[PDB]
Design a protein around this ligand. Structure first.
Ligand SMILES: O=C(O)c1ccc([C@H]2C[C@H]3[C@@H](N2)[C@H](c2cccc(Cl)c2F)[C@]2(C(=O)Nc4cc(Cl)ccc42)N3CC2CC2)cc1
Ligand SMILES: [Zn+2]
Length: 94
């Protein structure tokens, strides 16, 4: 479904996404999607927003991640949906 090339996409985060990213990783102007997914994953894990042994759901109603995505929770299995939510919070650079 998801191609390997997606993780090579170069992106400029919008301000709220950039704020989230800077709380877990070095600040730079441009990131790859691989970086954005790693850093968001680490944000989720460190903050214990992910209930793995509970239908694999991230709960974000009480966190800026919920403002970023516009949902109170989401399944981590729904990669296509997660990409869409992330895409809306960045500009692709080419
Ligand atoms: O048993 C399954 O069937 C199963 C179990 C787990 C996953 C999940 C865990 C991982 C990864 N796959 C997921 C992911 C990686 C690449 C691209 C995408 Cl679109 C993606 F969603 C990721 C991640 O690595 N970064 C990131 C960032 C956000 Cl915003 C949301 C979720 C994640 N998950 C981190 C985990 C803390 C929640 C998928 C299926
Ligand atoms: Zn399971």
């Amino acid at each position: 479904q998801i191609p390997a090339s997606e993780q090579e996409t170069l992106v400029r985060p919008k301000p709220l996404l950039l704020k989230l990213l800077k709380s877990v990783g070095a600040q730079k102007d441009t990131y790859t999607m691989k970086e954005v997914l790693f850093y968001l994953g680490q944000y989720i894990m460190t903050k214990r927003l992910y209930d793995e042994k509970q239908q694999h759901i991230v709960y974000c109603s009480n966190d800026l991640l919920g403002d970023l995505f516009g949902v109170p929770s989401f399944s981590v299995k729904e990669h296509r949906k997660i990409y869409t939510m992330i895409y809306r919070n960045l500009v692709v650079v080419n």
